[PDB]
Design a protein around this ligand. Structure first.
Ligand SMILES: [Mg+2]
Ligand SMILES: [Zn+2]
Ligand SMILES: [Zn+2]
Ligand SMILES: [Zn+2]
Length: 647
């Protein structure tokens, strides 16, 4: 069996720190229990000749250890020592070094407040002293990332809550989001405007050597260019990162598979499932058996694919935005190895119903029967599958909250109440559909969504101080485009409503630098409020939330910004709760499901659970609520349709 890439174990770490050991300070020490796996395999079977390590014949001392059945390194496929293995290389503007000297050059650069690219297990990181305001601002400037929070590597987990330390020290070694109050050493440009910081521990020998030396937190963020796939080869690292990194700590062991760090909350909630979890298979729910080989393509953002067969499913690592330049190479290499590992040949392909998706174009190149699944049906089903809801388990009422997905008859959904089972999705109601002014621009500039909401729902909107910058523009050109349906499609998007409220509070920049930045900012603001008595509501009118009443009460309820943010989350949760209660009770449904990327909002979860104590509630935990779990949903739905003998 192949197991996920694993953090250096205590025994290899001790061997590495023991003077006189042959592997003393060797940055590529591994044994049968730890080290790279999925990332160094060319083809099956798992055997040194079919791994990146075939290039390095073993010295006799190594080979004796590889061959002794009682030795920790028995059949350690990528075992090596300094005599026979890979070695470090340092590259920096006409300066070069190797081995221990390569390591010391990188350490001296980091200590001086410089930024170094470091080769890891599944790609390259950019690093610098996370206490150094100057270094962190220079990294943000060079990478054009003014806001998006940076992951930080700490030497140890001391001082973090027990739940965080437990997750941080598993073989998977994820990034764990922890309250920033636990880590005062971090300069304030690490996650500005947010309440959490992603911390990780050293999990490969090179990282242990660095942190043992530096004894301070290091920014350890992905080594890529925005809009491009991460580098996995030295040449592509050297090329992509030359404007950013002051020097490069690289080496000559190949990485064959892109594998980003996994990201979880301290609570155990999965955000990004990659290194340490891939390629572990998951058991399908009861009633799923003898399923034919199905390839599920997932969706266009935060992509994962899924292989479904028998009574199991296996998800790929995070592969990013499928629209990015040359991402198909990494996607394809990941598909090849995963199919090789599981001896899998698909008979069917399932993909999203949006005909404009890249993933849909890729499906048509495959020469297999294809089928389509609505985006929000798949979110809801991934959450049912994760909770082991049986094939014949019965209908639930689902709340699927995200930015935008294609719904029935070409509609753009993102804030819907649905009656759902593994075969059917019936739309019951939700947010009103509101123009996205400027189409793709509506996700980047929150004021567009505020304008769209004001035009539809807020009489005399120009008189409110919340709308001043909008009001002062020549917004009437945009208003005219909106009336005429020119690049202004209607969407009932929960994410765009967050954006509209964030625009009205002024709590993100006018143009955003990353997807979801305004919603994250609004939630961080709301979470500093412990709850407040307020008059803001979102009544139910038929089967939609009445935003006219909402805006009138919210815009006229003066209070500190945190309390206004809180009141929005509370009113939205109460209004959706009332919709779901009526829908579920009158159909005799006792179980509710919640899914979509907006459901990663902790305040909204907590408020929903508060108003829906009379129901059994299913939220995602071991898979991402967002598009990272979508392939799974597609897979259980295709399986359930086949199992029913559907045509
Ligand atoms: Mg602390
Ligand atoms: Zn080990
Ligand atoms: Zn050796
Ligand atoms: Zn989605």
């Amino acid at each position: 069996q192949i197991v996920p890439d694993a953090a250096t174990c205590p025994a290899c770490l001790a061997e590495m720190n023991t003077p006189g050991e042959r592997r003393y300070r060797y940055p590529f020490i591994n044994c049968t229990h730890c080290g790279p796996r999925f990332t160094i395999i060319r083809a099956m079977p798992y055997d040194r000749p079919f791994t990146v390590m075939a290039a390095f014949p073993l010295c006799p001392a190594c080979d004796k250890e590889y061959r002794d059945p009682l030795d920790r390194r028995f059949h350690a496929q990528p075992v090596a020592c300094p005599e026979c293995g890979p070695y470090l290389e340092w590259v920096s503007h006409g300066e070069h070094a190797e081995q221990e000297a390569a390591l010391q050059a990188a350490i001296a650069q980091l200590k001086m407040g410089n930024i170094v690219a470091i080769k890891g297990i599944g790609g390259f990181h950019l690093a610098c002293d996370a206490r150094n305001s100057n270094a962190v601002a220079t990294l943000r400037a060079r990478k054009h990332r003014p806001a998006k929070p940076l992951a930080v590597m700490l030497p140890v987990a001391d001082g973090l809550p027990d739940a965080a330390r437990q997750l941080l020290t598993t073989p998977a070694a994820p990034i764990v989001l922890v309250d920033k109050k636990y880590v005062p050493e971090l300069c304030d440009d690490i996650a500005p405007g947010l309440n959490e910081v992603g911390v990780m521990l050293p999990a490969n020998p090179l990282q242990h050597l660095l942190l043992q030396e530096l004894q301070c937190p290091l920014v350890m963020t992905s080594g890529n260019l925005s809009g491009k796939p991460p580098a996995i080869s030295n040449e592509q690292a050297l090329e992509d990162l030359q404007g950013i990194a002051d020097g490069f700590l690289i080496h000559n062991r190949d990485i064959v598979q892109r594998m980003d760090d996994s990201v979880v909350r301290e609570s155990g909630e999965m955000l990004r499932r990659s290194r340490g979890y891939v390629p572990d298979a998951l058991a399908l729910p009861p009633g799923f058996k003898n399923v034919p080989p199905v390839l599920c393509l997932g969706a266009d953002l935060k992509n994962t694919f899924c292989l479904v067969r028998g009574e199991q499913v296996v998800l790929s690592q995070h592969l990013g935005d499928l629209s990015d330049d040359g991402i198909q190479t990494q996607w394809r290499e990941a598909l090849r190895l995963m199919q090789n590992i599981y001896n899998f040949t698909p008979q069917y392909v399932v993909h999203d119903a949006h005909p404009g998706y890249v993933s849909c174009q890729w499906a048509s190149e495959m020469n297999l029967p294809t089928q389509t699944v609505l985006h929000h049906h798949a979110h809801a089903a991934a959450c049912l599958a994760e909770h082991q809801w049986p094939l014949d388990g019965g209908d639930v009422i689902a709340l699927t909250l995200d930015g935008i997905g294609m719904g029935e008859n070409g509609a753009l959904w993102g804030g819907e109440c649905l009656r759902v089972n593994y075969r059917e999705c019936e739309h019951l109601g939700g947010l009103p559909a509101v123009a996205l002014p400027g189409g793709d621009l509506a996700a980047k500039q929150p004021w567009r969504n505020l304008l769209a909401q004001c035009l539809r729902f807020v009489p005399e909107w120009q008189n409110y101080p919340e709308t001043a910058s909008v009001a002062a523009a020549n917004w009437s050109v945009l208003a005219r485009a909106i009336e005429r349906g020119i690049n202004a499609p209607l969407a009932s998007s929960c994410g765009r409503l967050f954006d509209a409220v964030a625009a009205a509070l002024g709590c993100a920049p006018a143009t955003l630098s990353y997807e979801g930045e305004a919603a994250c900012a609004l939630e961080a603001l709301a979470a500093s409020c412990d709850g407040v008595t307020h008059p803001v509501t979102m009544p139910r009118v038929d089967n939609q939330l009445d935003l006219a009443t909402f805006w009138q009460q919210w815009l006229n309820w003066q209070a500190p910004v945190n309390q206004r943010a809180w009141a929005f989350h509370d009113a939205l949760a109460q209004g959706f709760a009332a919709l779901m209660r009526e829908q579920a009770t009158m159909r005799g449904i006792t179980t509710l499901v919640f899914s979509g990327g907006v459901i990663h909002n902790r305040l909204l979860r907590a408020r929903l659970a508060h108003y829906l104590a009379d129901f059994t509630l299913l939220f995602p935990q071991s898979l991402p609520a967002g598009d990272g779990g979508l392939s799974l949903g597609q897979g259980v739905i295709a399986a359930a349709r086949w199992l029913a003998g559907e045509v």
